[PDB]
Design a protein. Sequence first.
Lengths: 407, 411
Amino acid sequence: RFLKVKNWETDVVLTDTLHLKSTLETGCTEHICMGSIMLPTKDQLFPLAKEFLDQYYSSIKRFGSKAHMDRLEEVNKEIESTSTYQLKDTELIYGAKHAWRNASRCVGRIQWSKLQVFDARDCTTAHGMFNYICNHVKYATNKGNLRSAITIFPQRTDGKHDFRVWNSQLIRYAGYKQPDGSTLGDPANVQFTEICIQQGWKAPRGRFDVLPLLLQANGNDPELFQIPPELVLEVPIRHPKFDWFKDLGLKWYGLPAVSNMLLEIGGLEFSACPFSGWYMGTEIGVRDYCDNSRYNILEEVAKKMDLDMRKTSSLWKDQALVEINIAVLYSFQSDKVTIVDHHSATESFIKHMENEYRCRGGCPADWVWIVPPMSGSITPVFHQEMLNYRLTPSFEYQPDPWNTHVW
Amino acid sequence: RFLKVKNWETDVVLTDTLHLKSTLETGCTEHICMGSIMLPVRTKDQLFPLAKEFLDQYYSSIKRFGSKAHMDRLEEVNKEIESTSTYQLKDTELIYGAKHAWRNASRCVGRIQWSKLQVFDARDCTTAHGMFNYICNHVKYATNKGNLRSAITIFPQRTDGKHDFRVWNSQLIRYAGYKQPDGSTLGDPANVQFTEICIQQGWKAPRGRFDVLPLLLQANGNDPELFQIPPELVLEVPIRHPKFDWFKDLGLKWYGLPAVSNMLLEIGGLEFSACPFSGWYMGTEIGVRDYCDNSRYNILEEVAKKMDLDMRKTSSLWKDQALVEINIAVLYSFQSDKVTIVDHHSATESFIKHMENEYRCRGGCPADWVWIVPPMSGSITPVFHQEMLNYRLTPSFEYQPDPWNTHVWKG
Ligand code: HEM
Ligand code: HEM
Ligand SMILES: Cc1cc(N)nc(COc2cccc(CNCCc3cccc(F)c3)c2)c1
Ligand SMILES: Cc1cc(N)nc(COc2cccc(CNCCc3cccc(F)c3)c2)c1
Ligand SMILES: C[C@H](O)[C@H](O)[C@H]1CNc2nc(N)[nH]c(=O)c2N1
Ligand SMILES: C[C@H](O)[C@H](O)[C@H]1CNc2nc(N)[nH]c(=O)c2N1
Ligand SMILES: [Zn+2]
């Protein structure tokens, strides 16, 4: 019930107590571990609300004060009356920061307290969402000097009035299936790209076309907007040694901005809460560029390097993979767009894990996602035992809206 | 119940019913996943159910379930347990049980090979000298001049737990680690503690960077005894790189035969506390872990120096670059000397075929993703994108405490 985690490289042992405050379930049981699975009324609301406010007032050192009891009372009164409630700005900021702090799959949580929170709870239309989002992108991009931020649209009500950003990221490239048989652009995005075409977008049918936004306000049908081109910072990818590399025509965008998740604070559900930081290099180089299901460019690079592709045991893939990742980091650094490498990112998370054990009693972490997708065991997270559990406030997955939308 | 696992690269979806035959526990709950934790006398009472369940599994596999032979064997084991309190496995059951422990080893990426396992029955062994001889024969048979063959040797089972057979070495072949007064380590830092035990017991340590450790063998609960593996029995490979001629001058080598000697083999409630087994290496086990862990040989700096990589910032990926070069060297050397080795691409692709096949013919394949995924280039190997259910089946291999923590010394 009081759990220990060992780091097998440093022998440092930490004691986890925070896990007892765990509320949601994992997918696992005593009989079966589901660690590698990608996706495992008035009644319930007040307990959820109280649980939250209790932690909030405890965090500001006013646990059991009149202000505390007053708010508890106040919120209770509002739920009984309105069947929901509203968070104070302070509570909203705190909630959102803590959903980040609690995301057990995020290697970048050392940063969790520097989140700029944009309260867009007054937004009513999809045009308004477009305005808030452009402001978010522009603030976050900060001419390549990236700052973390989240924009929070209004909370879910009866659930027929949801705000949704239909894009999975604010900034993503299109994907088109061709008669050709193969896929042009980003294969991860074919379906959503078809929804954009079938809502009216005129696709340029390039390899790297920035998707338009599909914004849904107040449960209405979603609308298309294009992010001003001048707000979408992009980096052309060159290698610091291979002159030919830039001839591959690769670019990526600078701003990672997840837009399809659901933020739950104190029982309240914010179904549109796009949030952003800055990239860890491997996210682009390893996954975006080299995944079979993605841009899949390893063969093309190995070829240009003239490696023996005859046998897997020449490790031509591994070699091409590293060079692609050197190129990503190099291109971003050259243009002064913030980026972190996996060595530096994971070292940061180990320091952060340690701060959270000594300051909070632990840190939920999901090893499967924390350990980078290349060079695993030469980063310190690999040797680090982690405990995975769910705390609230949290970010959660929600069904793609096209599967849900009453048209 | 039916459980599904998706492959996110191929969209292949599999269905597992085998997890329903699981008994042992995971250490996870509905509130906490312990999937990345490294290490999460029996009585007549528990014994017969465990025996019966094993023998039902056995008798099904040979299509004799419910036969008279089946029933008489249950009868016979029942009796033996009641009067003698344990029981003896037949050779064929022993063989089946050891194959199955391997098959059920959820952290093993090499299970495609599970049915080709030479079983050596050393249950007539009585002394440490007897153990030595069995182990030498194992090592010589498994090595097979570089054309490695899987094998296991199985010494007598636990009785009162006061008479255990144990191999104190953690692998049969392993390099001495020596702690220096200055605080640095000579040889393999993983094996420092055990090297001290060997020295304390009378080994004359050559004190090099690559000294093959002597065996420390306990028979029948007696104090362990020391023996040297005949050097001519120990196949080693000097490590060179195909383009980098300076690689050989690093002075690296490694042994050909990976042979785990510190696990417990549980079959039908019986506990085989000495059961050394050996296979062949996946390159990354030597090239990533043994050479480049900071707690092991730790040769990354030195390799990247010689390659003259920009070592000022980690974002040049100098570590990653050197790691690949070392791993190429390891595979290249073993291939050049005709010592069996598999690369991590080939190994993980074979496992995915094995795993699918196991889903078709067996109803599942317990797998531990934290362990199956290789320690380099994770995401470009097909296992990375494979969802996997982890659970425990018997027969099984288990950890057991190091014998120096538990042995009652006689003197
Ligand atoms: C500041 C730089 C940041 C870095 C380097 C970073 C890093 C990452 C990485 C590498 C992942 C792995 C998932 C994948 O491979 O796609 C991840 C997951 C995640 N991060 Fe971050 N992160 C950052 C900022 C943020 C921010 C600002 C938030 C939210 C406020 C956030 C919330 C998440 C969540 C919710 C997940 C996982 C979603 C899930 O459960 O599957 N991160 N992060
Ligand atoms: C055929 C060659 C084999 C290869 C390439 C292979 C590969 C591996 C690798 C890479 C691991 C991960 C452990 C680590 O990285 O330290 C492993 C684990 C294991 N393998 Fe194998 N294996 C082979 C044969 C065998 C054999 C013959 C057995 C026994 C019959 C066996 C039983 C195990 C067990 C028990 C584990 C996991 C230890 C644990 O639970 O922590 N393997 N295998
Ligand atoms: C804010 C931020 C910064 C940064 N450097 N990296 C990130 C990456 O975080 C996320 C968060 C949510 C989702 C994703 C995309 N990754 C896989 C999600 C997923 C789940 C289930 C099914 C899928 F097809 C895909 C990535 C986020
Ligand atoms: C038979 C065989 C072939 C092959 N290629 N590789 C192996 C490696 O498998 C094992 C099996 C058991 C133990 C080990 C040693 N490493 C993990 C055990 C362990 C536990 C706790 C802490 C550690 F540092 C190490 C490795 C075994
Ligand atoms: C099957 C497995 O859960 C899946 O491939 C995971 C593994 N680890 C990951 N880790 C990160 N950071 N991102 C991912 O998308 C995945 N995919
Ligand atoms: C803490 C973590 O579980 C530990 O480092 C594990 C991770 N995965 C591993 N995977 C393999 N194959 N071998 C190992 O020793 C480890 N170590
Ligand atoms: Zn689990």
